[PDB]
Amino acid sequence: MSDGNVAWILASTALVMLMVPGVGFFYAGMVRRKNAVNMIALSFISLIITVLLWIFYGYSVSFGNDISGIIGGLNYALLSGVKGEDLLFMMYQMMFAAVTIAILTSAIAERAKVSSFILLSALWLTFVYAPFAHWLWGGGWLAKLGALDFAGGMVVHISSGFAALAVAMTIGKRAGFEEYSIEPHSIPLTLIGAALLWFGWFGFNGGSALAANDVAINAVVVTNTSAAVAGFVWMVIGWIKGKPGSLGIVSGAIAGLAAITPAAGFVDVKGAIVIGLVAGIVCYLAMDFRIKKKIDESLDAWAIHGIGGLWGSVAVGILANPEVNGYAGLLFGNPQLLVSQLIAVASTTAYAFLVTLILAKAVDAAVGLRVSSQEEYVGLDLSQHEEVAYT
Amino acid sequence: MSDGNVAWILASTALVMLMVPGVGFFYAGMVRRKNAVNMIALSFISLIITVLLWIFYGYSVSFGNDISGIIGGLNYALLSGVKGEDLLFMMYQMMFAAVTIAILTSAIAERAKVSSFILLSALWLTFVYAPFAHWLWGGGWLAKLGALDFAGGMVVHISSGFAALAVAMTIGKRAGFEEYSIEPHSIPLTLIGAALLWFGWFGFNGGSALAANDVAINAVVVTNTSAAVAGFVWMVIGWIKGKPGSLGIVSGAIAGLAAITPAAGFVDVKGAIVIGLVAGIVCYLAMDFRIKKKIDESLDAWAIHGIGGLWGSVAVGILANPEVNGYAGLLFGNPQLLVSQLIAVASTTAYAFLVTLILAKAVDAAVGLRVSSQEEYVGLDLSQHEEVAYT
Amino acid sequence: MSDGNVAWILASTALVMLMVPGVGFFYAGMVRRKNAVNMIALSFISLIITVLLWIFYGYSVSFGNDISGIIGGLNYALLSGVKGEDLLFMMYQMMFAAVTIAILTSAIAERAKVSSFILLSALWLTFVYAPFAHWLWGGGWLAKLGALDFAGGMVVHISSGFAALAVAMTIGKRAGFEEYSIEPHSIPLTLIGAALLWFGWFGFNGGSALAANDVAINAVVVTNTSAAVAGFVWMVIGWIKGKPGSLGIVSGAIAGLAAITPAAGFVDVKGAIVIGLVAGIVCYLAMDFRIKKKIDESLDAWAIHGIGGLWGSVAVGILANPEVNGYAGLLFGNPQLLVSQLIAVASTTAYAFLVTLILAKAVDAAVGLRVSSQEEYVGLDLSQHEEVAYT
């Protein structure tokens, strides 16, 4: 099977798995001390829950026999009939789902019942993630329309980003969100998370070529390029508005990483530079706007991943370079690829937001998403885990 | 030599090396602030000491010319006559030894002299680890009886687990262990360690196939499966007894990882599910029991690794699937494989505990294992390292 | 292109990238709480700035058309004409530059303007790093004289080490540096950085063979060997002078890693043992000496990397083993290789120090390197980033 290709994907799988707790640390540092354990714990639970549902039926529903082009069958339930390289693909994809669910916890920071999060996550993975993966990567209707998504601009970033906006609107603002600002309890912990996310993204984008080839190498080059450019943009914006906070710098880098994800294997370094530059700008504007609208989409999964994934996914249809990986976008003579991307971006953006809204409200009505006021006050570490982060 | 296979093992080696300080962080977060540096430092010392002894003679004593089937000769001392792929195997195995020694520090948490730990570790590596590795992986008597151990269920987990129980009983309870409970100074630091251990285990179990092949891929699938199931079990037990603490969740995942280690390359996903489920249950019962017996085996190396490695090693003889890697267990028609495992588990469990007990007491008599009461009071960071963790 | 070789280098690239924030954490734990974010932020900025300059022209100036043997042309600007494996080489080398710049931040700990650091870094990368890389690795004059540098003993360690000494002397001592000692705010954070640096060094030295072969395997064996020996030396020195602090242990390991870097692919285990042992000793003496001279080269980039890289680079000419990788040093009959190393070490050491001194003073005159006294007092987290590390 080419030991080298299996070697690279085995490693890329480990790298993406690390990104799950990586998201947890990234977010934990931005919430209050009394919620530090909860924020981290949520990412580990996201991993555990995803592994189980994925092998049980999540993998099958995503990449199984296509039915009407919107979802897969159950022929791969419990991995029945999944062997050889399919098992490695299954494993690799499993981690994309896990990271997606973790990114989503941004919207429930500091005020959700763990049990309700588990319920909603299982429903979301089933009715939003699996479908998306199938549409684009499982021979679904979007792939048929000619839409592309190299590493998850829509499957992972738009889905979690817009799903996060809907959840934030359903669960409500944290107490004191509008009156007083919430200070990050540990920026260093967040920076450790940021380091693990940049590192693991080598496997996220670089492993999506499913081989140690020229496409993987290109994906690694443009991924670092877009991250650097977008991170630089936020640094400049920071100086323009005051001082360059470290949170802004890494948030900018992640915007660049999310935007380049859908295009990593189709664009050149110059295209990567444009994607990162625009990503840095549009994502910053999105953050300021949701803040102005007073929406407590806490850790900006929407502004960074949602908007970052949206731009990047559209950018594919504009900048795809034929000399890089065969596909050509608008600027390279093919207006058709741009239309496929817009259809894909429009579909996934609307479904993610609207279906998540339905799922959130449903769970809220069935069991209640938010913790009591007193638990929010004492913190979820004590309330939901009976633990104290630091002594 | 197949660049792909060397690529995967070179990477798996780096991954296992990371697990050494990973254990240090995992444990450091569970002890008091005044002992944080000591707990971490012990894992780095474990690495440094292991590298030196291994190249000097540890590697040879483990995989050198067999003498009577219980130990290897000195033909590989100072790596004399070790080249090519043997050097990569030597390097990879070196890290398993290091992680094993680090896991063991669980038993001396907060009250051991660093010098004595170094002395005991060198003796243990020599008279317990090297022998075990040789018996099972160096063509020793256990391998001859037909016993199997894919990634270290006995060599690494039973050995450190039961060695930890003996050391805990020899060194004694921490001051105030029985009167008052010791609070973890930093659960987030422990969660960072847990993230690094799960990540590195991709190289631990996945690299034991010694190639980027279908066995490695299978090992990676079942390893994540068992971890998820056992982690889920502890989460449920947590809710049943109160709230799901994050420590319980990751401790459960590690139980699953330790239990699947001896079987990662021989069982299927369904077998992995049973191993993880039982691992979660038996390891939790073991923790409650050693606690009830008031044994201060501090960070539960015994309950998690000892008992987890024991079950998993026996499970190999029950669930090994011929279609996975040729070997068949009791449930697949071969009762012979189960008997080989029981003999191997019975031998390694008794030797680890009894020989470690002799070694611990010997070192205790020769130099004294435990620090003075005043040093235990002020903490080992100041007392043994003249350092203060946080300012 | 051999999927296995691309696999190993793709992974080695991710590993070296992780070392950049790794340096940040390593250093952050050693400075005061009020400067924790600044120290970490500097490493992320080092990464972002390096990625941009490298693709823009840094890569070309280092490995482009040679002009007079001292620098490369601009034929590779914006990666023009860089494809296939050259892109992977470009990516891999990019990270060496980033780590080098991060190591350098040792000299400006707690008192530099971020803007000035960015300016100086861009100038340094242009006039010191690019030249060095070209001289030794880009077919420059030093490579022509027969000088060798396997993974960066001179390109990365001597350059940052001596550049750090010059910068420290230009920017001046931190307030209270001579009167009172600065306590590390978080040794555990530093130990997390040390763990990431040891881990990533598998890709640093092991990936420099540019293939998953016997040279990579050898590099990995001797790299861990030298680290262990030098780390052991500092532990012993620690006990001789009091107690073995964890900072001393990991600082010793890093000295061993820096010293073995230039020789990783040319020496045997016995040579690695000598290099690590001497590295441990000479680097400790260098630290004590710069301290005695009251030079506030804060986090000892000079004593560890500068002196460690110098010894190691010279050691190559003494211990290179023909049976390992063809090259032979003085002890193996070839006095010629030693002379090439001394010329290379003498040139890079003098240029790094003198040119950096010119660059530092120039930037200081143009914009001012040091922050105001009040900003140094309140801390750079607030002053330069308007952030507070912990709440």
Burial of C364 (0-12, 13-18, 19+ CB in 10 A): middle
Nearest to B87 among C32, C221, C244 (CB): C221
Q: Which two tokens stand for residue A188?
A: 């260093």
CA-CA distance, C236 to C240, in Å (whole number)? 6
Question: Residue C81: which region, alpha, beta or left (left: phi > 0; alpha: psi -120 to 50)?
Answer: left
- Output phi, psi for A25, to 5 deg: -70, -40
Taking Cα atoms as reference points, which of B207, B225, B220 lies closest to residue A47?
A: B225
Q: Which residues of C touch A199 (CB under 8 A)?
A: 14, 17-18
State the Cα–Cα distance between residues C159 and C151, nearest whole angstrom.
13
Subunits close to A (at least 3 CB pairs below 8 A): B, C
What is the DSSP secondary-structure string of B248-271?
HHHHHHHHHHHHHTTTTTT--HHH
Please name the amino acid found at residue C296: D
CA distance C70 to C76: 16
Tokens of residue C269, six digits:
């285990």
Question: Which residues is B112 bridged to in the sheet?
Answer: B370
Provide the β-strand partners of residue A131.
Answer: none
Beta bridge partners of C71: C67
CB contacts, 8 Å: A88 with chain B: 217, 220
Q: Which residues contact C324 (CB under 8 A, 6 or more apart)?
A: C218, C265, C266, C267, C268
Query: Which residue in chain B has the smallest CA separation from A193?
Result: B192
Query: Cβ contacts (< 8 Å) between B192 and chain A: which residues?
Result: 21, 25, 192
Cα separation, C62 vs C129, in Å, equals 8
Q: Are A192 and A202 in contact, with CB atoms under 8 Å apart? A: no
Beta carbons within 10 angstroms of residue B281's beta carbon: 17
Q: Which residues, other chains included, contact A140 with Cβ-Cβ below 8 Å and sequence gap of 6+?
A: A66, A69, A70, A71, A131, A134
- Tell me the torsion sign for CA atoms A201, A202, A206, A212: negative
Q: Which residue among C184, C191, C249 places its CB closest to the CB of B391?
A: C184
Torsion of CA A36, A37, A39, A43, to 10 degrees: 150
| Nearest by CB: A391 against B183, B199, B227 | B183
Q: Indicate the DSSP class of residue C83.
A: -
Whether residue C98 contacts residue C20, with contact meaning beta carbons closer than 8 Å, is answered with: yes
> Per DSSP, what are the bridge partners of residue C186?
B390
Chain B neighbors of C4, CB-CB under 8 A = 2-7
A118 to chain C nearest CA, in Å?
Answer: 29
Residue of C199, C206, C231 with shortest CB distance to B48: C231
DSSP A370: B
- Nearest 5°: the CA angle A138, A142, A147 is 105
Q: How many CB atoms lie within 10 A of CB C38?
A: 31
Q: In this structure, is the dihedral angle defined by the CA atoms of residues A183, C379, C43 and A21, taken in order, positive or negative? A: negative
Structure tokens at B36: 């944080």
Residues B140-167: b if buried by 16+ CB within 10 A, e if exposed = bbbbebbbbbbbbbbbbbbbbbbbbbbb
Measured CA to CA, the distance from residue A53 to residue A129 in angstroms comes to 12
Please tell me which residue of chain C has the smallest CA distance to A277: C52
Cβ contact A253–C44 (<8 Å): yes
Beta-carbon contacts of residue A335 (< 8 Å; ≥ 6 apart): none
Residue of B10, B375, B382, B386 to mutate, testing the C interface (most C Cβ within 10 Å of its Cβ): B10
User: What does the radius of gyration of chain B's CA atoms come to, in whole angstroms?
Assistant: 20
Cβ contact, residue pair B220, A91, below 8 Å: yes
Integer-rounded Cα Rg, in Å, for chain A is: 20
Question: How crowded is residue A388: how many other Cβ atoms within 10 Å of its Cβ?
Answer: 17
Could you identify the residue written with the tokens 């890389």?
A: C133
Q: Do A44 and B187 touch (CB under 8 A)?
A: no
Nearest CA in chain B to C34: B391
What's the residue count for chain A?
A: 391
Nearest to B17 among C192, C198, C246 (CB): C198
At B214, list the tokens.
């279908």
CA distance linking residue A310 with residue A258, whole number of Å: 9
Taking the CA of residue B186 and the nearest CA in chain C, the distance in Å comes to 11
Displacement of CA A133 from its chain's centroid (Å): 13
Chain A residue numbers touching B249 (CB-CB < 8 A): 41, 44-45, 48
- Structure-token pair, residue C49: 């700035």
Q: Nearest chain C residue to B84 by CA: give it.
A: C214
- Measure the CA angle with vertex A248, ends A246 and A252; round to 5°: 120
CA distances from residue C358 to A273, A344, B368, C100 in whole angstroms, order as listed: 33, 55, 57, 19
Name the nearest CA neighbour of B212 among A11, C214, C9: A11
User: Which chain C positions have a beta carbon within 8 Å of B83's beta carbon?
Assistant: 214
Question: What is the distance between the alpha carbons of residues B84 and B92, in angstroms, rounded to a whole number?
Answer: 13
Nearest CA in chain C to B17: C199
Domain limits, chain B:
1-391
Per CATH, the homologous superfamily of domain C1-391 is: Ammonium transporter AmtB like domains (1.10.3430.10)
Backbone phi, then psi, for A64, in 5-degree steps?
Answer: -85, -170
Look at residues B310, B181, B179, B308 and name the one whose alpha carbon lies nearest to residue B254. Answer: B308
What CA–CA distance (Å, rounded) separates B127 from B132?
9
| Phi, psi (rounded to 5 degrees) for B370 | -85, 145
3-state secondary structure A242-276: CCCCHHHHHHHHHHHHHHHCCCCCCCCHHHHHHHH
Query: B10 vs C185: CB contact, 8 Å cut-off?
Result: no
Structure tokens at C83: 């494809």
Q: Which of C6, C9, C10 to mutate to test the interface with A (most CBs of A within 10 A)?
A: C10
Task: Spell out which residues of chain A touch residue C48, defining contact as CB-CB under 8 Å.
Answer: 227-228, 231-232, 235, 249, 253
Residue of A nearest to B200 (CA): A14
Nearest CA in chain A to C38: A246
Contact A219, A150 (CB under 8 A): yes
Contacts with A4 from chain C: Cβ below 8 Å = 2-7
Contact assignment for B390 to C5 by CB distance below 8 Å: no
Q: Are B68 and B136 in contact (CB under 8 A)?
A: no
Q: Which residue has the tokens 């449903």?
A: A362
Taking an 8 Å cut-off on Cβ atoms, the answer to whether B198 and A17 are in contact is yes
Question: A11, A18, A176, A27: which is closest to A108 by C-alpha?
Answer: A27
> Is B246's CB within 8 Å of A47's CB?
no
Q: Do B6 and C212 touch (CB under 8 A)?
A: yes
Rounded CA separation A195/A32 (Å): 21
DSSP count for chain B of H helices, then E strands: 18, 2
Residues 6+ away with beta carbon under 8 Å from A288? none
Structure tokens given for C124: 């340094």
How many other C-beta atoms can be found within 10 angstroms of the C-beta atom of residue C75?
A: 12
Note whether A18 contacts B199, CB cutoff 8 Å.
yes
B104 and B163 Cβ atoms separated by less than 8 Å:
yes
Contact A286, A303 (CB under 8 A): yes
**SS3 category, A112:** strand
Length of chain B equals 391
Helices (H) and strands (E) in chain C, counts: 18, 2
Q: How was this structure determined?
A: X-ray
Distance CA C360, CA B108 (A): 50
* A379 conformational bin, left if phi > 0, alpha if psi -120 to 50, beta if neither: left
Give the whole-angstrom CA distance, residue B32 versus residue B388.
Answer: 12
